[PDB]
Amino acid sequence: MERLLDDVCVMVDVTSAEIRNIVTRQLENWGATCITPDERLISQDYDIFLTDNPSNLTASGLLLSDDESGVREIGPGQLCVNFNMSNAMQEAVLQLIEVQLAQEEVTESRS
Numbered sequence: 001m002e003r004l005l006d007d008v009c010v011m012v013d014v015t016s017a018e019i020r021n022i023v024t025r026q027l028e029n030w031g032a033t034c035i036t037p038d039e040r041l042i043s044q045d046y047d048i049f050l051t052d053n054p055s056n057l058t059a060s061g062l063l064l065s066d067d068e069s070g071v072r073e074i075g076p077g078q079l080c081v082n083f084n085m086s087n088a089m090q091e092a093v094l095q096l097i098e099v100q101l102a103q104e105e106v107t108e109s110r111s
Helices: 017-030 086-104
Strands: 008-013 034-037 048-052 062-064 071-075 078-081
Touching: 008 017, 017 034, 017 048, 017 086, 034 086, 048 086, 062 086, 078 086
Parallel strands: 008 034, 008 048, 048 062, 062 078
Antiparallel strands: 071 078
16 A cells, blocks of 8 residues: 555556546556656657557557456557556556566567
8 A cells, every 4th residue: 555656757648538537646646747648759758658548559558448347468568457446557557667677678679
């Protein structure tokens, strides 16, 4: 029972205006600085990325699923987490920060 983020910059780009407001309240309680993904850039500097709907994910991070009741992984760097259950988002945050710290950059993009 603590501020899981404490003072962590979280870039949260949620298309659904209302859902963004909801999740913002949640992250802010955890001590997450909800930042915008710039305006014209592809991405900006952050610690954890959050987005609404899979199509909004610029690369990897946490995707909010209103159709979810928990937190599930659908691929590397892709996790569908529901915003209704903050306990589930809690696990998602912890897993995200850990996997990001472990695999910060893996250039598996072969050309």
